[PDB]
Design a binder for this molecule. Structure first.
Ligand SMILES: *[C@@H]1O[C@H](CO)[C@@H](O[C@@H]2O[C@H](CO)[C@@H](O)[C@H](O)[C@H]2NC(C)=O)[C@H](O)[C@H]1NC(C)=O
Ligand SMILES: *[C@@H]1O[C@H](CO)[C@@H](O[C@@H]2O[C@H](CO)[C@@H](O)[C@H](O)[C@H]2NC(C)=O)[C@H](O)[C@H]1NC(C)=O
Ligand SMILES: *[C@@H]1O[C@H](CO)[C@@H](O)[C@H](O)[C@H]1NC(C)=O
Ligand SMILES: *[C@@H]1O[C@H](CO)[C@@H](O)[C@H](O)[C@H]1NC(C)=O
Ligand SMILES: *[C@@H]1O[C@H](CO)[C@@H](O)[C@H](O)[C@H]1NC(C)=O
Ligand SMILES: *[C@@H]1O[C@H](CO)[C@@H](O)[C@H](O)[C@H]1NC(C)=O
Ligand SMILES: *[C@@H]1O[C@H](CO)[C@@H](O)[C@H](O)[C@H]1NC(C)=O
Ligand SMILES: *[C@@H]1O[C@H](CO)[C@@H](O)[C@H](O)[C@H]1NC(C)=O
Ligand SMILES: *[C@@H]1O[C@H](CO)[C@@H](O)[C@H](O)[C@H]1NC(C)=O
Lengths: 120, 361, 50, 254, 50, 49
């Protein structure tokens, strides 16, 4: 909050603008990275209620309906195992929507093969 | 946004333009209790003052000195400083103070000065040319004077050589006015050096006895124990104020704290070495210092070819501290929140997006 | 004295932004790899060894 | 008044291990659940500390160089150790600091004292013998405070002379070990900072005689020296220092 | 004088470390490519043209 | 080996620790690169005589 410091800082020009613009570019690059990784489908697929897959069990990777976060047991274990002018911008996609994207990808690759990645 | 982008046309998107600040409202200075005062009451208002050839030297140290009471007193007829300022005595700090108290004649009050030549200056009390401090003098005709004449106050009249600064001479050697040998035996040209004053109530102004206290300051490598008084104000909580606690200053919100300090500890630090807890010096209570709600001001707009309507996002700011909607990214003002879900046009964050159709979120 | 503090803190902030840009390039490369694995291993069967 | 003590038994001084003692709080700052690395005058872990005895006939009151600081450990019962002697030449030429705890209060004086060659106190079996000085000419600082005080009590002290400030850190610890320093951890709280502003290069412990000649009560004390080094201090949830790491002891703690 | 020499040598060392980080990122990209070629050309037969 | 230089350098903080950390990261990244490229088999195969 020192005004004399900011008056002396104006002598150095647009350094602060360059630092803010570089950090803004990094911040939008992270959201672009998440968009390119997880949002590869525009249809949100669901598995059928009956899990008859010829003996194949996907309960450890399908979302658990009993959990409020709608995560798989493996994804829940993964989320449990990871632990002055400064601001932290939140990510554009929340963890619930990233879990929804992975659930859609799992439902597509279980019920439809590789056909959903190339068309209907 | 046009000012920030240096352009008269703004493309559709969100642009961080400014930085919201919760402006400090008050200044809170809390300083501890003004105890252990310097004993100026036994120097200025003592029972019996000393003579000028044997002036009493009182060492003022390890205490806080209130010079405002001494300076605002109207009884003093002379308050002249030669190395400091009278209005800055309560602000400056000194290692120790030497208080020299004596009684002189009213015409000799000017003789306690640097560069001044007189009988009191040469033979009774001498000040250096680089003297620092203040000379205080007041009339004492109602106390010291006696109708039979107060002869108790003596003064030195003769010496071979002048005094060094801050030098006493209580010797009673018989002066040699001439060149005749005197072995302590008084004669025609050999007189006793100490003569008594003639303080009587019938004399006018100039012959009345004046009590003088001279304060001299030392600025050695010893620690500055003698300092001025500290005027602590009232404490205001739950507001973004400028706090000044025992020389530690800053800006923050001062709330009640559940951290129980040990009695020797005063401040509290987190991992990142920022002061987040503190003890008030007046009342021993623990206060958390939450930083004021700084945030980024982002402007959400479509193209200026399309419309001039904008929305403002205050990042990480609750909506009660600034078409008002609360997001996890912050408070969004100017966008109507709807229950329908569309594709993301302008990203806000935490799953919130904005679009133009008015601006909806 | 404030000018000395300003140039020190500005050098620190430039150092932080530079290493953040380098780490952002590394994370972008890893995310492009992850998107490639998402396209080729999940959305299809890959003949590429390992 | 001075008295030569001529019934001592000649014996070389002992040495023992410091273990993890001598730690004090470097500042007045509360810290919660954090590890703090600090650079200050600290006592080395597992160091060679000089061990002095008072037993019957041992009466160890020598003059030792102060260096940059003194750690004083006291395994004390029945209050034999009463104070310390601080100065440079220990005569009237220089100015010396006196710390005494007699039967009533603690007195701290900065004056020009004439120290005896063998200064002590004495208890008659009632304290009625004070022979620690013969004169006191020019005083600059006086300070009267509240009293600081099988071996039952453990008294740790740190004395530092930094920028004219005299720091006294102390901690009271209830122990039950017979002979040597116990092994454990106890951080010393800051008690009082003294504005002395004097040169100190030598020190001497003050003991107390028991009269019923003289008899030395059972006591033992320890002198350690403070060195500039780095500690990694651990602060718990309640904000007390529970463990420390000496960064220059071994490569593991490094 | 040492303040001038320290800031000059610190700027030189920071420039060197930044260039080394950029070159290390380039060499890491080349090594990831080389590991991909080791997996797909040596440990198998690749249908990828060129 | 100038101790006055290091005393003045401690006023600038942890720049040297940052540079040493970056160089250590590069140094372990080179070994990671060689490990990723060449150690793709855990069995040391031998040609027939
Ligand atoms: C698929 O796998 C899950 C998990 O391995 C099976 O659920 C287990 O069922 C047995 C008996 O019904 C229980 O004792 C376990 O506690 C269950 N495990 C969990 C994690 O819930 C499930 O039976 C399998 N088969 C089907 C058809 O879902
Ligand atoms: C106790 O012993 C000391 C040391 O023997 C005495 O100190 C000496 O006293 C003589 C007496 O004139 C002096 O000439 C020496 O210069 C002193 N030596 C030192 C090192 O100070 C001390 O006087 C004795 N105490 C009494 C009461 O006699
Ligand atoms: C200081 O002054 C306050 C005045 O409100 C008083 O309550 C308190 O007891 C005093 N003493 C201390 C040690 O805080
Ligand atoms: C006498 O002087 C002292 C100066 O410290 C002052 O505090 C006191 O009030 C004075 N006495 C009277 C009766 O005014
Ligand atoms: C402590 O010092 C004495 C004498 O200097 C020596 O004999 C002894 O071995 C030392 N102890 C240790 C543990 O180094
Ligand atoms: C303890 O010492 C102080 C000052 O040295 C003295 O005033 C007091 O009388 C002493 N106590 C006894 C019991 O002699
Ligand atoms: C110190 O004491 C001696 C003798 O008591 C005296 O002659 C001398 O003037 C004193 N000095 C000071 C600075 O008080
Ligand atoms: C302190 O005393 C010692 C020995 O008497 C002397 O070597 C040193 O120079 C003195 N320091 C100061 C600052 O007077
Ligand atoms: C901290 O204090 C609480 C009491 O408030 C106590 O239960 C707990 O054991 C203490 N923890 C430690 C590590 O001393």
């Amino acid at each position: 909050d020192s005004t004399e410091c900011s008056n002396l800082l104006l002598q150095y020009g647009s350094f602060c603008t360059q630092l803010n613009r570089a950090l803004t570019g990094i911040a939008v690059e992270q959201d672009k990275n998440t968009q390119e990784v997880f949002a590869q489908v525009k249809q949100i697929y669901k598995t059928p209620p009956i899990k008859d897959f010829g003996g194949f069990n996907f309960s450890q990777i399908l979302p658990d309906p009993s959990k409020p976060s709608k995560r798989s047991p493996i994804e829940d274990l993964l989320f449990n195992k990871v632990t002055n002018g400064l601001t932290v911008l939140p990510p554009l996609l929340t963890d619930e929507m990233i879990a929804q994207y992975t659930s859609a990808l799992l439902a597509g690759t279980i019920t439809s093969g590789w056909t959903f990645g190339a068309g209907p | 946004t046009k000012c920030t982008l240096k352009s008269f046309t703004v493309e559709k998107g969100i642009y961080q333009t400014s930085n919201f600040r919760v402006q400090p409202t008050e200044s809170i200075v809390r300083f501890p209790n003004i105890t252990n005062l310097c004993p100026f009451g036994e120097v200025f208002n003592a029972t019996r003052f000393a003579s000028v050839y044997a002036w009493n030297r009182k060492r003022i140290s390890n205490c806080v000195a209130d010079y405002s009471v001494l300076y605002n007193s109207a009884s003093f007829s002379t308050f002249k400083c030669y190395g400091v300022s009278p209005t800055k005595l309560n602000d400056l700090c000194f290692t120790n103070v030497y208080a020299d108290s004596f009684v002189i004649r009213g015409d000799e009050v000017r003789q306690i000065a640097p560069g001044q030549t007189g009988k009191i200056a040469d033979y009774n009390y001498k000040l250096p040319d680089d003297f620092t401090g203040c000379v205080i003098a007041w009339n004492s005709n109602n106390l010291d004077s006696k109708v039979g004449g107060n002869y108790n106050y003596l003064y030195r009249l003769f010496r071979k050589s002048n005094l060094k600064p801050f030098e006493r001479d209580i010797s009673t050697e018989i002066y040699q006015a001439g060149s005749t040998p005197c072995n302590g035996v008084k004669g025609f040209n050999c007189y006793f050096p100490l003569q008594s004053y003639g303080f009587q109530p019938t004399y006018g102004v100039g012959y009345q006895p004046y009590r003088v206290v001279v304060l001299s300051f030392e600025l050695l490598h010893a620690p500055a124990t003698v300092c001025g008084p500290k005027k602590s104000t009232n404490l205001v909580k739950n507001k973004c104020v400028n706090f000044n606690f025992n020389g530690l200053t800053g800006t923050g919100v001062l709330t009640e704290s559940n951290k129980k300090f040990l009695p020797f500890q005063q401040f509290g630090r987190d991992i990142a070495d920022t002061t987040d807890a503190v003890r008030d010096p007046q009342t021993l209570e623990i206060l958390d210092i939450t930083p004021c709600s700084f945030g980024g001001v982002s402007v959400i707009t479509p193209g200026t070819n399309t419309s001039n309507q904008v929305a403002v996002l205050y990042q990480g700011v609750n909506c009660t501290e600034v078409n008002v909607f609360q997001t996890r990214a912050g408070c969004l003002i100017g966008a109507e929140h709807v229950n329908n879900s569309y594709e993301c046009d302008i990203p806000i964050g935490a799953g919130i997006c904005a679009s133009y159709q008015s601006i909806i979120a | 004295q404030i000018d000395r503090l300003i140039t020190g803190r500005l050098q620190s902030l430039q150092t932080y932004v530079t290493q953040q840009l380098i780490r952002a390039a590394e994370i972008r490369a890893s995310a492009n790899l992850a998107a490639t694995k998402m396209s080729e291993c999940v959305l299809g069967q890959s003949k590429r060894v390992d | 008044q001075c008295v030569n003590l001529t019934t001592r038994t000649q014996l070389p001084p002992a040495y023992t291990n410091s273990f993890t003692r001598g730690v004090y709080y470097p500042d007045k700052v509360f810290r919660s659940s954090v590890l703090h690395s600090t650079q200050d005058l600290f006592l080395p872990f597992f160091s060679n500390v000089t061990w002095f005895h008072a037993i019957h006939k041992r009466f160890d009151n020598p003059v030792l160089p102060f260096n940059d600081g003194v750690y004083f450990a006291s395994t004390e019962k029945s209050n034999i150790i009463r104070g310390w002697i601080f100065g440079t030449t220990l005569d009237s030429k220089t100015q010396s600091l006196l710390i005494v705890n007699n039967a009533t209060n603690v007195v701290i004086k900065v004056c020009e004292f004439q120290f005896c060659n063998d200064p002590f106190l004495g208890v008659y079996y009632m304290e009625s013998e004070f022979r620690v000085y013969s004169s006191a000419n020019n005083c600059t600082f006086e300070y009267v405070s509240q009293p600081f005080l099988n071996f039952k009590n453990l008294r740790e002290f740190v004395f530092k002379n930094i920028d004219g400030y005299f720091k006294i850190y102390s901690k009271h610890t209830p122990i039950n070990l017979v002979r040597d320093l116990p092994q454990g951890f106890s951080a010393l709280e800051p008690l009082v900072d003294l504005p002395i502003g004097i040169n100190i290069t030598r020190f001497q412990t003050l003991l107390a005689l028991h009269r019923s000649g003289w008899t030395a009560g059972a006591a033992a004390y320890y002198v350690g020296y403070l060195q500039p080094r780095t500690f990694l201090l651990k602060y718990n949830e309640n904000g007390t220092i529970t463990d420390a790491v000496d960064c220059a002891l071994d490569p593991l703690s490094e």
